[PDB]
């Protein structure tokens, strides 16, 4: 059993065979395949260029570096979200435009399996492909799993609001990886005519952005957004991006005389200087002093005129997006622990009175975008029904989650539905055994909790209950069925209704069953509140 070697457009790559319990045949894995030229030097803040071809056989058996990011938050996220038994050491580099492939196909024969391309999350600031082991999903469901990387943070999203640094470099990377998949995936036994993009959090927003982008035409055939869409407004910068660009430049020690000056100066800084700039900006944290409307906890997607021609809201109203089957889902308690913990969010005392709730909601402006005049109505609605300050804290977490994830996700699915595309929603409500031990036991369906199920963590890690094992089997089959057919349903599975005018969705957890009208009262409350 000599190792698997296949042809890419840029030359040959060598992978490794790995076995999984319960399967007679191994899965072929390829780690660290480049899909573009490393974006170093003058290639910073420019679109991804094609990779240089290589002679002989590239050894693709080592994990690539993760894109430069805060190593504290980035390592923490990898540890909390990995489906693998052990945490892998990951290097940081600007040289990070790699993908990893897991294929169960026999590479000596023509195979055209459905391909699932995973776009990780981490607020467009942190994260790695290598965190997510495709082995279980590939073997259990007979799909090719591709995990991709894309530039993060300053490297990925620096925008001057004009032609000197349009922005969205990370998204163009995601597009470039999808073009690589079109050109190459058949050598790995994948069907370039059946590509499903899926991602969580910022990866779900990225998926949503690709559904909105003419650059992504002909590159995918199904989409799945898990806890994140293009209406998750913390990730999309509308209006004037030039003052945040200037703040970044000034922090880096660059003059702000013109756009071209700022971008040129930043292209001169070392990786290290830019990482120090990143840390000094205190991204992924809330500012508790200063005008909340000027606070930017992350850099993000911009309306650049190449990837996105208008705002997501405008493109939606026009029905100008790709009408592929789209599954959009949320977890029950999206702001229950993970996100506030990662942001060092002030709610640690375990309780909240209504006056404190109101100033904190105001400080939370970059996350929720609620004008100071709307704060009292918003707060009263969620917290005003109880005098218990412990329960006020919990309802406050629901408020944040509803505004960041629940409402945006339902709005996106309704528009997608009304454009005539097949649409499905879920709400995931389970507390995984793989949860952090600092996470309170009452938090069920936290941000990220579905990832263990989707990626088959019970098959790779120790300690899963029988119920968790079955939950993962069901979720993987739903997801792969959707990749195959644009419909997650099939034999042995609870019925998942289409999200049509009755708004059927699947509640996923210990008691998986269909329900209707996910977040309906919350969409009505918020959209009408925001409309003055």
């Amino acid at each position: 059993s000599s190792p698997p070697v296949v042809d890419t457009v840029h030359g040959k790559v060598l992978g490794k065979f790995v076995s999984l319990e319960g399967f007679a045949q191994p899965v072929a894995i390829f780690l660290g395949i480049p899909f573009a030229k490393p974006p170093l030097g003058p290639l910073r803040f420019t679109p991804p260029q094609p990779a240089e071809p290589w002679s002989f056989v590239k050894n693709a058996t080592s994990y690539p570096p993760m894109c430069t990011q805060d190593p504290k938050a980035g390592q923490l996220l990898s540890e909390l979200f990995t489906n693998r038994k052990e945490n892998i050491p990951l290097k940081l580099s600007e040289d990070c435009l790699y993908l990893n492939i897991y294929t169960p196909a026999d590479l000596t024969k023509k195979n055209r399996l459905p391909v699932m391309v995973w776009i990780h999350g981490g607020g467009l600031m942190v994260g790695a492909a290598s965190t997510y082991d495709g082995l279980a999903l590939a073997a259990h469901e007979n799909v090719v799993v591709v995990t991709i990387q894309y530039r993060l943070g300053i490297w990925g999203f620096f925008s001057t609001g004009d032609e000197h640094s349009r922005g969205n470099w990370g998204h163009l990377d995601q597009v470039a990886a999808l073009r690589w998949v079109q050109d190459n995936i058949a050598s790995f036994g994948g069907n370039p005519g059946s590509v499903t993009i899926f991602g969580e959090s910022a990866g779900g927003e990225s998926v949503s952005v690709l559904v909105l982008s003419p650059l992504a035409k002909n590159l995918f055939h199904r989409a799945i957004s898990e806890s994140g869409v293009a209406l998750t407004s913390v990730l999309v910068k509308k209006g004037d991006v030039k003052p945040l660009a200037e703040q970044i430049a000034i922090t880096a020690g660059c003059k702000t005389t013109t756009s071209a000056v700022m971008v040129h100066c930043l292209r001169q800084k070392t990786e290290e200087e830019l990482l120090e700039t990143t840390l000094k900006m205190k991204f992924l944290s809330l500012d508790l002093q200063g005008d909340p409307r000027e606070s930017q906890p992350l850099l993000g997607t911009v309306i650049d005129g190449m990837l996105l021609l208008k705002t997501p809201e405008e493109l939606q109203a026009e029905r100008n997006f790709h009408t592929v089957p789209y599954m959009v889902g949320i977890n029950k308690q999206e702001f229950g622990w993970l996100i506030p913990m990662l942001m060092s969010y002030p709610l640690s005392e375990g309780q909240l009175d209504q006056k404190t709730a109101m100033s904190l909601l105001w400080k939370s402006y970059p996350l929720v975008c609620i004008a100071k005049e709307l704060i009292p109505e918003a707060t009263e609605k969620y917290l005003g029904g109880t005098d218990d300050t412990v329960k006020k804290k919990d309802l406050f977490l629901d408020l944040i989650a509803d505004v960041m994830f629940g409402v945006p996700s339902v709005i996106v699915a309704r528009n997608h539905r009304d454009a005539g595309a097949p649409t499905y929603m879920y709400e995931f409500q389970y507390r995984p055994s793989f949860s952090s031990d600092m996470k309170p036991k009452t938090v069920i369906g936290d941000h990220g909790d579905e990832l263990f199920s989707v990626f088959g963590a019970p098959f790779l890690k120790e300690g899963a209950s029988e119920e968790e094992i079955r939950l993962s089997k069901m979720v993987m089959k739903f997801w792969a069925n959707f990749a195959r057919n644009g419909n997650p349903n099939g034999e042995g599975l609870p019925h998942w209704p289409e999200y049509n005018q009755k708004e059927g969705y699947l509640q996923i957890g210990a008691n998986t069953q269909a329900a209707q009208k996910l977040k309906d009262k919350e969409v009505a409350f918020w959209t009408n509140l925001f409309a003055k």
Copy 2:
């Protein structure tokens, strides 16, 4: 009245409407339109590259930076030459390849007005387009006024005398702006088939250089050189440019091992380091210790084999230049105050004996190029007729002016005439009220004094006499008539004869009238003196 928005080849630009007293309709102004890619990084000391196109609408309502230059001399020149009521704050940057447009045309209709493209002065070392407000000229004469920028100083003119840094980058910028005008000016209501280039001092030399250059073919149809031509020898470096190149490199902290080494090293220096290099070289100053033949108060035009194929003298003798109508003029006292003040020239004591005159003329070698053996004849001719040391100083200033401006200008006009082209000359003899208060009251027709009239300073600034107002009206109409027709004459205007074999020219001032044989005895004296 929504703001004016028009299409360029690189995308849409938004300007602003501005009103002028006595005109019912406003003028559309566009500030800071890029005509090339910012020449940063590896684009230093290389020709201008095309601008990157932009999405959406570029807001062209802020003044661009001026090209990097000594801020003392550059700010001073802007204050002394601006026709505007107030001094505008200007930034310095290498990112300076912009132009500003003033158009009186209705941009919703096809308009094809004559276009006048202004090339500012400042010894190819300082200056800015934004100094010159086109509003009055555009409204009074119904022309499109374009003020352009071009690289200055080291950035603009660094030459190794070979293919690694040919030089004349500022001139190729001027050519690139003219190509932009050809491609775009119709959207601004201009006639690309009627473009007049005009400039003063180094801008007049630039105009003269374009008349001599095959690169400028088909780019303009009339020319005007005000106090500066390609025979103003201080601006043109013939012979060996490599020792000044080496001195620049050494000052910057670069090795001089080869040409390519020097240019590559200089491309690594920060803007600031190069500006510090500029100041340490003491450009725009006379060296009063050391061999005057090695003194270089400015970098300048070189014979690079692309822009200029031979020396101006050789091209003239061959009649190898563009035979467009050309107006060439001087002021009465070109070295009366402005230039010696800007150069910290030694003549401040108000008088000069004949022995001191002679060593000072020798120190003035980079300005006048008079061999030490010719000094006594030159000095005797100008100063030898009086024993009054005050009047010796004044005749000495005439000597300098005659050699730098008067003689060169007449030689250029005679050659242009003898090639069969329409040619006109003027001598401007007026002391503007806008003169500096440090300028002695006896100086009339100083370097720059015509600019107030040409640009309609009486219509924008406070304090002009009725006579100044009429002088500007006359000068603007002469200039615009020339732009339209290649002949400045028209109804209501004093008769301006062609510069033909009788050498008629116009004396412009309080008593505007025709005369003959401008500087005839001075051309005879100097050309024969220089011919040993």
Copy 3:
């Protein structure tokens, strides 16, 4: 007699006429003609790019810089090997892609003389073209002599073992100069259809590498390797080059996270930093502490997939190489003084016992590649026949020479012969009067000793005996005859048999005569020892 001016593809070049005693007509010399763009900045560790064309006439009368290298070893080598009367001052620069031409042809008439292109030696770490004056060879034999430069050391040979820095930049330079010769040499009176490559030491290995390379197709018609071939294993790195690449990066102060990171970081270092890196690595020295198998005294040729598709041994076994006439030769005592002196090799005490011999042979692993288990047999064979420790030292020097030069050269000639190509060998056995005064008088046919004869040092330097004069005349005629005809023989010359199955070769020295079976017993001993 105005100076010679000729047309190249990139523009005109001006040379100088130089006279040589005994010749009525001068030789035209051109020094410092560029054949590529200077490899500065982003062009480091990339193939040579075409030179930028120039206007007017390039003055080619100054020696170019030598490629950046250790100035101690590089200056020393130039002084020891120059055939010229005096040592010329040479600058160091990365800007070094120049060649020098010596032509005896009348440049006003069509001349098509044989061209001999010299590739200097210096272990791919040091050396210069300008060291070798082509004047005598050009005049005596009526050939055009071209001496070329190529990148050395880190600049020339840095390889990551993949597509981010393939390596062999110096060899691609050699190829680029040969393409320049094809395109241009006719203007210098040379026949582009008769080009002979010749070189010594690393230059002989380079010649051998070109015979093995599909890139060199159609670029030469005869080859001569003097004391160096592609089987001189110290110059060719097989197996894993990544740890030496990492050591270089670490020494330079670069991270080793990925290949692209290392190469990008090294492209940021100044020439000086890289030269300091070079010196800190102690190239051209033996490491007397540490594992000899990890010791790298030079960077070298790699199997890059562009220049060399497989190992030299593999290409030979396949008969996949250019079957041009090839003369391969060695000197009698290749390790007699020059090389051990340049490497600060431990054998200075003048004697060697057998136990010390054995550990020193082990330390010499990077030069000879003899596995520790083979050491006792190798040492016994050479030193075991005498108890005289002085003679043991001399036999030890023979051992090294046989493994580095003698055996490899004969193997190469046998393979070339067996492919059906015309092949000739020599062994040079003379002690030049131009030898260093530190060289012991008993050393005859040291590394480099033939260069004086080949380049006509007796005609340019002082002090040659009549016999040396005749030896040089004979050697130059043999070499030039070979350039003309692929056969060195001719009237007035001792008979030089073909290297056929009888293995005839020429012993060159005071008594020049044919012999047979050069190093036959040594090839048998070593090839069978290495085959376990």
